[PDB]
Scaffold this active site. Sequence first.
Site, PDB file in Angstrom:
ATOM      1  N   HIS A  69       0.109  -0.788  -2.477  1.00  7.03           N
ATOM      2  CA  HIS A  69       0.747   0.393  -2.997  1.00  7.03           C
ATOM      3  C   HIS A  69       0.370   0.604  -4.469  1.00  7.03           C
ATOM      4  O   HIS A  69      -0.069  -0.307  -5.159  1.00  7.03           O
ATOM      5  CB  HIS A  69       2.309   0.332  -2.867  1.00  7.03           C
ATOM      6  CG  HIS A  69       2.919  -0.682  -3.781  1.00  7.03           C
ATOM      7  ND1 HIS A  69       3.110  -1.991  -3.425  1.00  7.03           N
ATOM      8  CD2 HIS A  69       3.429  -0.581  -5.039  1.00  7.03           C
ATOM      9  CE1 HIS A  69       3.645  -2.657  -4.434  1.00  7.03           C
ATOM     10  NE2 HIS A  69       3.868  -1.811  -5.417  1.00  7.03           N
ATOM     11  N   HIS A 148      -2.400   1.830 -10.857  1.00  3.91           N
ATOM     12  CA  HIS A 148      -3.179   0.745 -10.314  1.00  3.91           C
ATOM     13  C   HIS A 148      -2.624   0.312  -8.957  1.00  3.91           C
ATOM     14  O   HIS A 148      -1.491   0.682  -8.574  1.00  3.91           O
ATOM     15  CB  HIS A 148      -3.122  -0.503 -11.250  1.00  3.91           C
ATOM     16  CG  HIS A 148      -1.775  -1.083 -11.320  1.00  3.91           C
ATOM     17  ND1 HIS A 148      -0.820  -0.562 -12.128  1.00  3.91           N
ATOM     18  CD2 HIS A 148      -1.212  -2.128 -10.667  1.00  3.91           C
ATOM     19  CE1 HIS A 148       0.319  -1.261 -11.960  1.00  3.91           C
ATOM     20  NE2 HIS A 148       0.109  -2.196 -11.055  1.00  3.91           N
TER      21      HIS A 148
END
EC number: 3.1.4.37
Length: 217
Positions: A69, A148
Site C-alpha cells: 500500500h 512511497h
Amino acid sequence: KDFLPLYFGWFLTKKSSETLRKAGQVFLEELGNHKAFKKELRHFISGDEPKEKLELVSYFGKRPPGVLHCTTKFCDYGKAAGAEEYAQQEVVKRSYGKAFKLSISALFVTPKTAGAQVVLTDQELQLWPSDLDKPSASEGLPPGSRAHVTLGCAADVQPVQTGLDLLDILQQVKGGSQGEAVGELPRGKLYSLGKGRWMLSLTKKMEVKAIFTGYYG
Ligand SMILES: [Cl-]
C-alpha cells in the site's frame, strides 16, 4: 462517537502487489551483489559482521504481509494530528473506494528501509494531506514527495521510517542527478548517495493498480 481508520491510502490489488513485491526483491538481490554496494558495506552496517556477503532480503526481513500500500494519512483512529480534518474532506469521501494507477519511478534502500517511490498524479495529489509537522528532509521538496510503498524494514525500524528515508534521498538529488549514476542494474541507473543510501531510477516507470480506502487493525 465514530472513529476513523488506522490510515487512509491506496491498497494495491493482489496482482499489482505481487508484481511490485517481486521487483523489489529482484532489486534487493541485484543491489546486494553489485560491486559498488559490496565495497561500501561498512557505510551500511555498523556491527561485527564478517567480511562475507550481506543478503539484503534477510536484512529487510520485516516485509509487508499481504498486499502492499501507499499511505496518504495516518490517522490512528482519530488520535493523530490532522486526522479528522483530513477525513472530512470532500475529495477523501468522493474517492473512497475509487481505483487509481500509481506510478513508481524509483526503488531505494537505506540502512533502515527499502521502498518504492510513488510519483502521484495531480488527481492523486488532492488526496495528499496538508499536515503541520514538516520533516526537515522535505525542505524545497514539493507536497507529495513522501509518497512511497514500503517493501521492507530492518528489525528495529518502524515502517513509517520509509517515507522519511525517501525524503532524505530526494534531498540528495533535488538539484538533478544527470551524470551521477555509479552504475546500472537491468531496469535503470543506480545512484550511491552516501551513508548507506541507494536509489535505482527506473528507465520506464512501473504502474500499479490500487484502491483508495481506509485500513482498520
Ligand atoms: Cl511530502
